[PDB]
Ligand binder design. Structure first.
Ligand code: MG
Ligand code: MG
Ligand code: MG
Ligand code: MG
Ligand code: MG
Ligand code: MG
Ligand code: MG
Ligand code: MG
Lengths: 127, 114, 100, 79, 151, 99, 206
RNA sequence: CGGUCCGGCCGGGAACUCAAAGGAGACUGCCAGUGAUAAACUGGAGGAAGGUGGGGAUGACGUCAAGUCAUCAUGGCCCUUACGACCAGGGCUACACACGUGCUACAAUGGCGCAUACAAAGAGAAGCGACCUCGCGAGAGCAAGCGGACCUCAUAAAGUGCGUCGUAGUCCGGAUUGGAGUCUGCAACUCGACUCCAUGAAGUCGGAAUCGCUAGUAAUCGUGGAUCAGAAUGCCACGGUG
């Protein structure tokens, strides 16, 4: 049976499936390099496979919907770590230290009435 | 280099070199090089006297330089003699098209004075 | 608004359904058909002879109780002021102060 | 400015231009129709175009064709 | 900061060499929230700086940073209507942040073809202490040694 | 074939309570019942000026939540059709019958 | 400062709608003006009949008006004499067929609209505003009101300078959404101007 | 999993994403230090979340005879063959100037050309309007679906890859004006938006002075909506990077 974990950051939602053998990464029926044009986005999904060892130990089939580049990339990072604890549960200690278990609750703040943006107040004039 | 309206085009790329003429913008410059069979990303160097005259004959079709200047000046004077709204505004040096005069009209009016 | 200004809108509505709904639309679409008559139509001319107030674009959206021409909302048919008054009294269904 | 499918002209002014050709040149044609396009059958006529208060008489020329009657009638006084 | 005593936000390290100091550096250079184009100028400048100075990318930065790093600075304080400049010893974390801030501001004020070139030539000038960036530490030094009595 | 019912109401604790009546009346009178499928709520938002004159930044914000419920009954049994027909539903709930 | 409408803020929390019908963007404008018009008639016709609330719901292509009244006898009449004449013109105003229901308001001294309308009718009879308020408060508290607040604004007793006077007894928590606050307004059209009446009745939490 | 027109597209599967109703959870509760053994704060564990977790709604008694008789209501006053009422044209858009709020800039962290990856929230029948066709284009003709997690508005743009320009009032910047059009509307002269061709102002980072913002904020990048026949750099709302 497949080892599953859901990961989300901002409006992005990523589903992660783990099966042992090889070091394959398939994102939305595409390659890791083919989907993300930035290497900074490529390294964050590699992060959970540093503390917990893998070079060619386990494969991953991933699908992500919504958000943007770092939004999707950050969501997958949360999903891998959730699928990793689904497989072991002793890895929790190593995953808390790196802070990958934590769901980044930082969302874009609503636009408010009387304000140009979420917090940006229009230019005041005394006279 | 020397094309139609006396002007001496610089030794830059073909498309930008042709925009130097009064009456030829980005679109006309592209259409002239496409009709004469010349590349857009090539400089004035290598472009022999045999490739220059074919562009001069190509550019000769549309009104350019001094011939264009007087044509624009004729259509402006025509409006002024007629006595229409459009002409009276060219006569007074103010925004013709309908733009506000209460403020920001400094392009047509000129720099402010107390 | 004024009683006369309210009355003016009634006239503009009554004439909008009389002509520019069943007759003037027939001569406007006719003044668009390229296949038939490219010169001799008079349809552009006979549109002028029809009353002005008959055109649907000549009507102004006014508050159904007060008559206010500004601050109108089509969903309720009222001005921002009377919308607030009726919303707070619970007379507007499913409407309440929202937060997110 | 306007769609190539017919230039505009008021019927009350159009009939006044027709009545002035057959009956010969009269006094200035008192009209409020500033929105009408000048036609070739108008050249030589004196049309009194309103400005808001007074009727401005403008002698119709060949070059005035295509333009509106209100262009030759200034609406705002500025001195 | 009247009542509330806040700490300091710990930013993620550099995606290339894993330096937190370079991650602060890319952020200082970064503009309009474009991290992608920001690190692109910082790495291209480091590549052209280490190559034209004798490798050691992390060390060639440190040499240029040691010359711009300030020891003391003045603090505006109005005691009796009069504004006195009090010389205060700057903390080690702010020491680097100010040193980096002036490198980015001095390269921005340069007339070179590109920002990767402007940065590289500014880091070269600072490595030999002869630029706009080192002068900003010098002017801050003369300001401190003058008001030395009000310490 | 299949009978599709679409429910619309502004109150949520009214739509799923009237849906509970339709689902229960159908499953009791012997029919295959799919759903209650909760379809997305359309949130119509309105921002009005609160002052009768000037005072631009002061505003009142309201919404109209249009809740949706989809109930699909697979078996068109006469015992189920007639039972659903003579069902006293809430007045503030719209019922859309699709064949 | 400026307070939020006590009824409006509690809608969906502890207070119900006065219009429970559903419509789309198409007929929402037409039904809302029909709801005004039907209320306009009944408030005008049953003015002496002590009407506190009016609930309008639209079952299919019909109108179900629920009149909340302190005097049901005069609203009903002689064995459906008055209900029939109302239902007849309500069906004419709405277009769709009409069905009128009458709801009995047990303790009127606890209903905001009836307390406000009493004060309003009293001011128009040339009674002292202080006496009118004090009686409203005392009547409410002795019948089990957990709290009460009554306000009267403008040219009080006919005075040239307008004032805003208010009395309060018990607990009136206007910030607790959980709290059952019955709020209503009424206008007294006096010989020396308009006098506004604001009443708040706290019936308890949850 | 079975079948492939390699499209969840069709049987199916109710796992998962999501949708929307109900429920759990965080209370300084635990540990340690500080502190009058108190309140509290600081740090740590566990935890998706920690000290009001993030945001909103909610504005006490009152203050300024503060704003609104032009939303409406209304005391008093004033006009009542006119201060009322109908209509055409005009004005609210004038222009020696001054001030306030914004948009767009002055460029290589950028301009242009081609290729290309990833959103969110909305609106829609007198409507949103695909596909196809014509036009360089704004658009036009023809005509499906959809009162809508189904259909349409609608291609997100920043970003990434390659090529070009090489510090030049420039392949920066777009004002102004000339010519020709498109659409809405009885009707675009005064005074609409948009396109095509040509034109190519000022401006190379702003004196005295001054404003916003403490985190998914500032900064920047696009998207939608109300009003609306048509008319957004304004307003209200949305996510992307950060
Ligand atoms: Mg040119
Ligand atoms: Mg009136
Ligand atoms: Mg209009
Ligand atoms: Mg919940
Ligand atoms: Mg509170
Ligand atoms: Mg005053
Ligand atoms: Mg340009
Ligand atoms: Mg703060």
């Amino acid at each position: 049976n497949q080892y599953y974990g859901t990961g989300r950051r901002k409006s992005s939602a990523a589903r992660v499936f783990i099966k042992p053998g090889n070091g394959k990464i398939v994102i939305n029926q595409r390659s890791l390099e083919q989907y993300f044009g930035r290497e900074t986005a490529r390294m964050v999904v590699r992060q959970p496979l540093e503390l917990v060892d893998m070079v060619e130990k386990l494969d991953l089939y991933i699908t992500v919907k919504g958000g943007g580049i770092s939004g999707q990339a950050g969501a997958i990072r949360h999903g891998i770590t959730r699928a990793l604890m689904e497989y072991d549960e002793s890895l929790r200690s190593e995953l808390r230290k790196a802070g990958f278990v934590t769901r980044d609750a930082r969302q874009v703040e609503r636009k408010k009435v009387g304000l140009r943006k979420a917090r940006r107040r229009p230019q005041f004039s005394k006279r | 280099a020397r094309i139609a309206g006396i002007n001496i085009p610089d030794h830059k790329h073909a498309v930008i070199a042709l925009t130097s003429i009064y009456g030829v913008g980005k679109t006309r410059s592209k259409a002239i090089l496409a009709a004469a069979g010349i590349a857009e990303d090539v400089k004035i160097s290598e472009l022999s006297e045999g490739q220059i005259d074919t562009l001069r004959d190509e550019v000769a079709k549309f009104v350019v330089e001094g011939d264009l200047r007087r044509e624009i000046s004729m259509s402006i004077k025509r409006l002024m003699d007629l006595g229409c709204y459009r002409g009276l505004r060219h006569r007074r040096g103010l925004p013709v098209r309908g733009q506000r005069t209460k403020t920001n009209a400094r392009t047509r009016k000129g720099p402010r004075k107390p | 608004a004024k009683q006369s200004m309210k009355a003016r809108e009634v006239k503009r509505v009554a004439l909008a359904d009389k002509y520019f709904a069943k007759r003037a639309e027939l001569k406007a679409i006719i003044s668009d058909v390229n296949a038939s008559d490219e010169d001799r139509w008079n349809a552009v001319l006979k549109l002028q002879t029809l009353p002005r107030d008959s055109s649907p674009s000549r009507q102004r959206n006014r508050c159904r109780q007060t008559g206010r021409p500004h601050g109108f909302l089509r969903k309720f048919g009222l001005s921002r002021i009377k919308v607030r008054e009726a919303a707070m009294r619970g007379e507007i269904p499913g409407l309440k102060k929202a937060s997110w | 400015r306007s769609l190539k499918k017919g230039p505009f002209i008021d019927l009350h002014l159009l009939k006044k231009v027709e009545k002035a050709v057959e009956s010969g040149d009269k006094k200035p044609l008192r009209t409020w129709s500033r929105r009408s396009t000048i036609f070739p059958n108008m050249i030589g006529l004196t049309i009194a175009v309103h400005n808001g208060r007074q009727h401005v008489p403008v002698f119709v020329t060949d070059e005035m064709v295509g333009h509106k009657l209100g262009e030759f009638a200034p609406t705002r006084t500025y001195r | 900061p009247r009542r509330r005593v806040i700490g300091q936000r710990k930013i993620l390290p550099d995606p290339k060499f894993g330096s937190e100091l370079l991650a602060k550096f890319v952020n200082i250079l970064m503009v309009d929230g474009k991290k992608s184009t920001a690190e692109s100028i910082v790495y291209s400048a480091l590549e052209t700086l280490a190559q034209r100075s004798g490798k050691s990318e992390l060390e060639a930065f440190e040499v240029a940073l040691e010359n711009v790093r300030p020891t003391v600075e003045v603090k505006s304080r109005r005691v009796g209507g009069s504004t006195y400049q009090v010389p205060v010893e700057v903390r080690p974390v702010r020491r680097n942040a100010l040193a980096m801030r002036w490198i980015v501001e001095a390269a921005r004020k340069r007339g070179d073809k590109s920002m990767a070139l402007r940065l590289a030539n500014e880091l070269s000038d600072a490595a030999e202490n002869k630029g706009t960036a080192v002068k900003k530490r010098e002017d801050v030094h003369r300001m401190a040694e003058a008001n030395k009595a009000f310490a | 074939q299949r009978i599709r019912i679409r429910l619309k109401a502004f109150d949520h604790r009214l739509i799923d309570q009237a849906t509970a009546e339709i689902v229960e009346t159908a499953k009791r009178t012997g029919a295959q019942v799919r759903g209650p499928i909760p379809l997305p709520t359309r949130k119509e938002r309105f921002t009005v000026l609160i002052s009768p004159h000037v005072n631009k930044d002061a505003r009142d914000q309201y919404e109209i939540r249009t809740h949706l419920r989809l109930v699909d009954i697979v078996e068109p049994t006469e015992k189920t059709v007639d039972a659903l027909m003579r069902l006293d539903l809430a007045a503030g709930v719209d019922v859309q019958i699709s064949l | 400062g400026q307070k939020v409408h006590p009824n409006g803020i509690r809608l969906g929390i502890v207070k119900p709608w006065n219009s429970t019908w559903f419509a789309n963007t198409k007929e929402f404008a037409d039904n809302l003006d029909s709801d005004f018009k039907v209320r306009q008639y009944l408030t005008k016709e049953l003015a002496k009949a002590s009407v506190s609330r009016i609930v309008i719901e639209r079952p299919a292509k019909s109108i179900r008006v629920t009149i909340h009244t302190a005097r049901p006898g005069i609203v009903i009449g002689k064995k459906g004499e008055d209900v029939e004449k109302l239902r007849k013109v309500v069906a004419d105003i709405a277009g769709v067929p009409a069905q009128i229901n009458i709801a009995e308001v047990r303790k009127p001294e606890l209903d905001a609209k009836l307390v406000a309308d009493s004060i309003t009718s009293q001011l128009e009879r040339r009674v002292m505003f202080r006496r009118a308020m004090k009686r409203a408060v005392q009547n409410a508290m002795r019948l089990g009101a957990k709290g009460i607040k009554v306000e009267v604004s403008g040219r009080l007793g006919g005075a040239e300078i307008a004032r805003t006077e208010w009395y309060r007894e018990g607990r009136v928590p206007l910030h607790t959404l959980r709290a059952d606050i019955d709020y209503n307004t009424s206008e007294a059209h006096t010989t020396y101007g308009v006098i506004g009446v604001k009443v708040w009745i706290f019936k308890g939490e949850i």
